[PDB]
Amino acid sequence: GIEISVYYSIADDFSFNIFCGFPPMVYCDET
Amino acid sequence: RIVVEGLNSCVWVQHHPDRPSIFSRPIIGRYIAAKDAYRNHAYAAYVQNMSVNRTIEVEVPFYQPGLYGMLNASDFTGLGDLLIGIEGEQPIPKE
Amino acid sequence: RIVVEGLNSCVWVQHHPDRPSIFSRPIIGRYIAAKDAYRNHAYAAYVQNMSVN
Amino acid sequence: DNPPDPTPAKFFVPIPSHSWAHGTNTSEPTNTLRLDGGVVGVGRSDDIGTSDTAISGIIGVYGLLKPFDWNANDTGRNVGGHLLWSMPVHPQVDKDQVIQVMTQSKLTQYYLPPISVVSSLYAYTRGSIKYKFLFGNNPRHNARLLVAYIPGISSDNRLTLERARNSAHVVFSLNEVSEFVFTVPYITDTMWWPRKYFVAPSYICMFILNPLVAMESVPSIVTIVPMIAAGDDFEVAVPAQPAVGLSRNIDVIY
Amino acid sequence: DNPPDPTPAKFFVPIPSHSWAHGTNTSEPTNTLRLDGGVVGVGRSDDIGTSDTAISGIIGVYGLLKPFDWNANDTGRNVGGHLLWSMPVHPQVDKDQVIQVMTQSKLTQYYLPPISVVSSLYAYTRGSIKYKFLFGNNPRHNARLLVAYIPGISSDNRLTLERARNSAHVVFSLNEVSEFVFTVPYITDTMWWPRKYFVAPSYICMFILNPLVAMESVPSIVTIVPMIAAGDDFEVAVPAQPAVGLSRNIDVIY
Amino acid sequence: DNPPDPTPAKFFVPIPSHSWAHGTNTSEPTNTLRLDGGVVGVGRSDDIGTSDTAISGIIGVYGLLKPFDWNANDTGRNVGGHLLWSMPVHPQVDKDQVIQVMTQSKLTQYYLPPISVVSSLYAYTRGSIKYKFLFGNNPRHNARLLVAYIPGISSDNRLTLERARNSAHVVFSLNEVSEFVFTVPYITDTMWWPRKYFVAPSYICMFILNPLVAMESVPSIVTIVPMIAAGDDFEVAVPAQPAVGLSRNIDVIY
Amino acid sequence: DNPPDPTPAKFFVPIPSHSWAHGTNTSEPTNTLRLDGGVVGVGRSDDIGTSDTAISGIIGVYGLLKPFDWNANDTGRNVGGHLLWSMPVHPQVDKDQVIQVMTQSKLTQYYLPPISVVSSLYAYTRGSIKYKFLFGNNPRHNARLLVAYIPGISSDNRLTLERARNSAHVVFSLNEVSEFVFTVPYITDTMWWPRKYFVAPSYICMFILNPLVAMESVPSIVTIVPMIAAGDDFEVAVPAQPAVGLSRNIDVIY
Structure with missing residues (x-):
């Protein structure tokens, strides 16, 4: 092994732009 | 101030402000419950290489719905749980 | 300035401002008395990894 | 000249990285991959709104x-x-x-309203909720409904109409009215209520008051569509493990 | 432009953490687990007093x-x-x-007065103490007591009434009086006196002066309850290993 | 005096070097090899222009x-x-x-115009291009050409003169004229067009309108030399892996 | 109070020491071995000049x-x-x-003039040189010399008097004159000339013009002592590996 792991975030100038719906989700507590 | 050594790999800490409060001992390893096992997403967490520095010093906030937290509880009253964990299976020293 | 090496682990220091003063030598290890053996609570103390410094 | 600089050496505590938790109200030292160096961001205009x-x-x-x-x-x-x-x-x-x-x-894939996705991202939440009921009917149907809000009840075991009329409720008459919003109060011993996926703080229920009428010329079924949005005072609290994931990949290992 | 920055490199002494001892009058660099970043604290009001x-x-x-x-x-x-x-x-x-x-x-579990718990947390201490004596009696009992404070005595070996009257003392008559406070002086060759759990700096004692009277209609036993609090000038000194632990778990390994 | 300096020790995140990407608008801490220490540069005059x-x-x-x-x-x-x-x-x-x-x-060694070397150093590019056509002829030749610019076409499959006259084009008559520049527009759905070495955004083509004439006294071949330079508004975008290397050593290992 | 200090942790690049090259126009962080701490130097007066x-x-x-x-x-x-x-x-x-x-x-131990030791410490050098010639003679000798300076010549192969008179030169007559200085020009295609221990930029030579006379009463030999110093405009350039070592220990291992 070489164990790589990448974490990420949004910059400062980043922006989400056109709000349409959310897709259907799945509850985590059902696992 | 969490001083976790032995191990000398990237270790991590994470605060679950509302998952309280069932017992007065800690819970080690395999006995922690299914959903507190791995890291979670979006809980306030911190990460540190035990190679760079051995001491993690963090400050836990007070996140509760109520007015007070209860000192001298008996057994959502307290500060929640603090989870400490390794980041990906460094081989563990035989003691 | 305490330079403790050999060992290279987290070492600690602590001052007992009033527990004096019986002797002119230090006391090593197993010969220190029952209540000066482990760390105490709330005495001014300090901790350092001999790995960092 | 090469004067000596004897000023004492300061202490400093090495750490591998910056704050993993902080998201706001701070700077973040980072190594940007730009030709430029400096506080720089991508351009915008009206073609591209704000976030x-x-x-x-x-x-x-x-x-x-x-x-x-x-x-x-x-x-x-x-x-x-x-x-x-x-x-x-x-x-x-x-x-x-x-x-x-x-x-x-x-x-199982659930279709959650936008308030239900947002509330899964946070640990506590409070404030009023709006329930907009939407009736498929025409001018010839008629009824009255009593929609009551019972604080501090889990399930309908002890719930009847004669009891529900003792709490906050609204009587609505669907006589050529197809939509109405019922902004339920928020009545709770605590300031923030924890997430659910627990018990819910209150309960809501809808009783026939005057039964539905209709004729031989008109459909006999009236479909009702309940819809839910957050009120004006609604607020969320502490970021937590999202209760829901995406359905992009629904495979699961038990 | 990319001008060079040749300014000499300063020294600096690496250490693993900040001060373990400091509790006041300073800042503490730390990695807080907040969404916010900044000097932030939990809100308060009158619902929640000060500390x-x-x-x-x-x-x-x-x-x-x-x-x-x-x-x-x-x-x-x-x-x-x-x-x-x-x-x-x-x-x-x-x-x-x-x-x-x-x-x-x-x-063994001791019930210590609040002055005795606080004084176990510190290494030295000084100032006056109040002893409030509380007599179970009614208007029909009567007596007089001489309560003396002897500086520089350990035990009662050489202590009699005829000697105790030579120090600071108070004569009290319990004739329809049920409580009195005796604020003992603080007389010591040193400014701070070390903790005890040593010898105590002084001694206190209480002699019958006029014996107790009572009748056939009244209980013959008078119970006295001694109580102790710190005076107005009392002060503690240097934080130390607490002399007392909690009784939550009283198991002990000899 | 040797007063103590108790000020808390700050955090700091060790890294092996400075920014590898930054080229402008910043300083660069570095260890210069000079006798002098300071921001110093080599002298200049008019003998040595600016860059x-x-x-x-x-x-x-x-x-x-x-x-x-x-x-x-x-x-x-x-x-x-x-x-x-x-x-x-x-x-x-x-x-x-x-x-x-x-x-x-x-x-294979290509002779690329200066715009083609510069455009290989960047990832996107936009703006007008100039095509200067240079005719070897003398006052006795004559013709007319229609040079059209077709936006959004890859190859000449569907391209004829009767169609090309429907786009931006220029009709040029080589009657004692030896050079003309055709500054082609830039018409594209996007603001920057990516590099090619993809498809090109547009196409250019040159049709005989009136055929070439000449006599028994004059050479019958007219050679045309096409040449290309960037227009006034032309701009390049993001530094990338150069599409071209130097030919100093052309050996290659397949 | 112990307010938290959340300010982000800066980057910093560790290095073992300060600049090894810098000699001027800067400070040098160092650990001085003094009882004092501070910018301190040894005292001086007129008893001890400046450097x-x-x-x-x-x-x-x-x-x-x-x-x-x-x-x-x-x-x-x-x-x-x-x-x-x-x-x-x-x-x-x-x-x-x-x-x-x-x-x-x-x-072999060479006696080098002070200009020749200094010029061995630097890589380039330029400006005029002074040659002071010193004649052992008395009022009875007489001669004339032509001392010419030939730019751009290595050796005397093509050098004769009839040619040397075509460059800068000085005619000197030693008739009761014992010393004269010949400040040779500096004529070179470049601004700094590199060190030698290469070729030299120019050449200098001294021809008999009128031969030496003397009598039976006077010594027939005239000794000349050449001496060399830097002119007023002479300058050195870049510190380099000294071309010369000291003779304190002349042992050498081939």
């Missing part, structure tokens, strides 16, 4: 819940007092009143 | 010591000069005048 | 493309509508209209 | 070169045009015109 993520605007949008029927020709369930529909009141809607799409051996 | 920990307010409260009896019908111990009660004067009360609850093989 | 690297000046210079012939005595290819020459329009000229020098087992 | 190391003052001093003879009774070498002495012009004098002390199996 739309302010919570109150996302959660203001109605999401839809499982619809259900009156059968006006049903002599049994169409009476004074029969309760049509009910559910505990909290932002994450109860799993049984959401539209579900079930797969064999996979996870 | 109540200011020492003088905690130690102002009386704690209770072992009560004891006069038997007015006792012809032996009820005389001129017989000394009822006494103890060395220091903030940690002596282990034998505290109410104890003893267990087999476990630790 | 000439400003992109618009480099890309303003014409580079040359493969020349080609009219044969006025050719009865076949010299007609109304026959298209002489054409190519997709982008700053990197297409590999088949450049002068090449081919070697056995080595790499 | 004398300013280059122009060191290189202003003449050093001596190999002396040589006229033999006025020599009928061969004492004629019109015979060239007495010559050498390439550069600050490090040529190894064969210096006084040497040779040892068996050891290194």
